[PDB]
Design a protein around this ligand. Structure first.
Ligand SMILES: [Mg+2]
Ligand SMILES: [Mg+2]
Lengths: 8, 228, 229, 9
């Protein structure tokens, strides 16, 4: 499972 | 109620971890027509990311159980996945249509255009994670096209280390890996985004460096994961 | 089908969807037949998770309301939201409490089931007490006390001192004393004797509940060290 | 904040 942009 | 009251409500709800409240506030702020300030924009994004996030995560669990149960246990898992799926599409369709009606047409500068075009890419990608039938090829192409226009607009108008440009590369690379199944294009895209930013670690600013460096870290980790 | 509703509850549980989970076990309990104990535990986990999300939101916002000592607008907004959260939290507590009064307690046919459901009744009145102000509150506190006390009496008579359920009851009853009744010395002595009595009879531990007993004994002792701080 | 009985569970 790839990681996408998290919350700031 | 007035926009600024709604915003403060959204921040209470966020602090209380009540993200459906949070989304409902920010949805209704958006529906007022005014261009979103960028604290506000971030709030909308956080609310909706957490609201779909819970479904994406339940969907994945109930999906695995459904496919690992070869009886009438499967009938029950299937119905539950579907019920989860339909909540999840309702969340994406809602954001999607806020993006078409208010957010994208109101975007005045490149930065916001890339932000929302990216979001539109994302929400289409969440729908693609979950689509079967003739549905799929259309959803995917929607996602790809939103990312693509965003990507082009960021290569022309943002710096290599802009968190929002970096984030778009990260998610566009994830789209290529996870949706299109093109690991080779996903790697090349992530690797160039990491390299161009890492050569300008000067030029980061105080408001953006934590985000830009964290994203660069994820570009790399993904790279590591996909070369395995 | 009692067994479908129970299979969906376990599904809901794995999907971390505790409101769905709680709705399954609710209608299970309404079929009016005694819960098995895998069932009773599913009900208890569900509502503990459902009410716990509200309690935790309540504390956050109740705290913001205190840090905004006027600051009137922010405090008003915090008060309103607190009260919106309270009302979800009362609906959840009332839902459980009528299940206890209408089905679970009346149908409990064994001593361990009665202690479990009287403790649960102590628990939900305690969650209502955390959040009551004024007229309401004494009545609510009394009811919590009375449920724990009944539970506590049956469990001293029927269960071994290391039984997870008797230990958990002493843990919660002592938290009621300290936190709702503000009687820390009474909380400490309830927790200390429940701990010492379980240490005296470590031979009553069994293989299948060992872990829970040992964990609760540790929680007993951690409250005590905290309360003695 | 005191700890009460957690889920088994
Ligand atoms: Mg993302
Ligand atoms: Mg609890």
């Amino acid at each position: 499972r790839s990681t996408s942009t998290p919350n700031v | 109620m007035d926009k600024n009251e709604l915003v403060q409500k959204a921040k209470l709800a966020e602090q209380a971890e009540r993200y459906d409240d949070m989304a409902a506030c920010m949805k209704s702020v958006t529906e007022q027509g005014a261009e979103l300030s960028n604290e506000e924009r971030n709030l909308l994004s956080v609310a909706y990311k957490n609201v779909v996030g819970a479904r994406r995560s339940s969907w994945r669990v109930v999906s695995s159980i459904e496919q690992k149960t070869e009886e009438k246990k499967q009938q029950m898992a299937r119905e539950y996945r579907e019920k989860i799926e339909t909540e999840l599409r309702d969340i994406c369709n809602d954001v999607l249509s806020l993006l078409e009606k208010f957010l994208i047409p109101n975007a005045s500068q490149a930065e916001s255009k890339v932000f929302y075009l990216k979001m539109k890419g994302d929400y289409y990608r969440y729908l693609a994670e979950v689509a079967a039938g003739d549905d799929k090829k259309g959803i995917v192409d929607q996602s790809q096209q939103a990312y693509q226009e965003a990507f082009e607009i960021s290569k022309k108008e943002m710096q290599p280390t802009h968190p929002i440009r970096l984030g778009l590369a990260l998610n566009f690379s994830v789209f290529y890996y996870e949706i299109l199944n093109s690991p080779e294009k996903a790697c090349s895209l992530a690797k160039t985004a990491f390299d161009e930013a890492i050569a300008e670690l000067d030029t980061l600013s105080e408001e953006s460096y934590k985000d830009s460096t964290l994203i660069m870290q994820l570009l790399r980790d993904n790279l590591t994961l996909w070369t395995s």
